Structure 1
Amino acid sequence: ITKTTVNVAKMVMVDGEVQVEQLPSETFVGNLTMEQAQWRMKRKYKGEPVQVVSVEPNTE
């Protein structure tokens, strides 16, 4: 496992309706657990309603 892609989404208010917007994926070196990824994304998008969708480790 040499890298981990974290896929992230945001709940957004558009024309008065709650929708979900895809945010840029971020690929980290090494293995990142889902707990680690959730923590990292909560610090990155301070105060905004973001949620980790998935993590994808790649072996090589």
Structure 2
Amino acid sequence: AKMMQREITKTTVNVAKMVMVDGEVQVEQLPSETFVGNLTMEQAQWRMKRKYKGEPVQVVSVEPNTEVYELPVEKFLEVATVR
């Protein structure tokens, strides 16, 4: 009767990087990145390989979270254009 809806889904991708520290290979903790849609582990790793060409970047986890932005229909008529 009164409610509308609009869904936004984003996947938070946690990444890590091999780096040289004092002549040893160690793991840099990278800031997590967020993308639009629901990405699997394989999808995210493909994106990371696209974004960081040749870099030793590992996707370590993917976390999808979906938000449902809703507005009363009455609220929408106030701002929408008749078109």
TM-score (norm 2): 0.65
Residues 13-36 of structure 1 show CA distances to partners (whole Å, capped at 9, x for unaligned) of 011111100112111112111111
| Alpha-carbon distance between aligned partners in 1 of 2:57 and 2:34, rounded to the nearest angstrom | 17
Runs (5+) with no aligned partner, structure 1:
none
| Alpha-carbon distance between aligned partners in 2 of 1:12 and 1:49, rounded to the nearest angstrom | 8
| Alpha-carbon distance between aligned partners in 1 of 2:53 and 2:29, rounded to the nearest angstrom | 17
| Alpha-carbon distance between aligned partners in 1 of 2:17 and 2:50, rounded to the nearest angstrom | 14
Q: State the shift of 1:2 in Å.
A: 1.1
Runs (5+) with no aligned partner, structure 2:
1-7, 67-83
- Secondary structure, in 3 states, of the residue corresponding to 1:47? coil
Structural RMSD (CA):
1.3
TM-score (norm 1): 0.88
Q: Which segments of structure 1 move beyond 6 Å, counting only runs of 4 or more?
A: none
The structure with the largest alpha-carbon Rg is: 2
Partner of 2:30: 23
Identity %: 100
Larger RCO (CA within 8 A; separation ≥ 6): 1
- How many residue pairs are counted as aligned between the two chains? 59
